[PDB]
Fold this sequence. Notes:
Chain C: This is DNA-directed RNA polymerase subunit beta'. Chain B is mostly helical. Chain B is built from 4 helices and no strands. Chain D is mainly α. The longest helix of chain D has 15 residues, at 22-36. Classes of the chains: A mainly alpha, B mainly alpha, C mainly alpha, D mainly alpha. The interface between C and D is small, with 4 and 6 residues.
Amino acid sequence: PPLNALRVFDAAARHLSFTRAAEELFVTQAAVSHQIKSLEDFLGLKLFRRRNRSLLLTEEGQSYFLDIKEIFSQLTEATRKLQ
Amino acid sequence: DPILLRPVDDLELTVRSANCLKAEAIHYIGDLVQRTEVELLKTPNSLTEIKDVLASRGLSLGMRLENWPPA
Amino acid sequence: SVITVGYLRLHQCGLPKKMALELFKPFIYGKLELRGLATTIKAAKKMVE
Amino acid sequence: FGIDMNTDYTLEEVGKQFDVTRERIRQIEAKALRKLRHPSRSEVLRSFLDD
Lengths: 83, 71, 49, 51
């Protein structure tokens, strides 16, 4: 699980879709899945309910979604240490 | 200069290059020309493309400008 | 228009400056694009107006 | 747009000729639009808005 995949998962949930998680991720809509497909190999389980119209939040996905917020909140602590 | 007051959409640059500068919130052509090559290589996803796309426009990175932005 | 007396030379006529632009309006349009001052004929007519 | 022809052709009408790509011809059109929306070629075309 690369740290580049770290910032593609957190934007997916709050944008309620993989393609809708691209405007604030300074990336196109294709790459948002390129990291997630690798996640289902290193970690090896689903995160979101993949559907045509939208995605359903999974209990495990939110647990990581909060885990991604622990990783970034303390990353800001290193940031404001420089500030 | 008629190019400074225009945004970064007047270059027809590659999509890989068209997305990299949006990460640093590049809004003006002057904004991107102020920053030099010694710090724009840090951003991932150019070195073999920006010089040639800008030379035909009569512009080059590394120029020094004052009163910027004039708004 | 009405006629009036002229100092003028035998080959010269006194035109009112207002009628000339109306009469030579296509000529003004044609030579205005040649001058490059109007990209389109619409702008030509606008600045004539 | 049927420019210099007798009629225009829709998405499938041109798709049956080159490729059956439905949204991809549409995004080709969108790419053409954004190319024509650029302030590099639209400068003279913008003058034709008042007619």
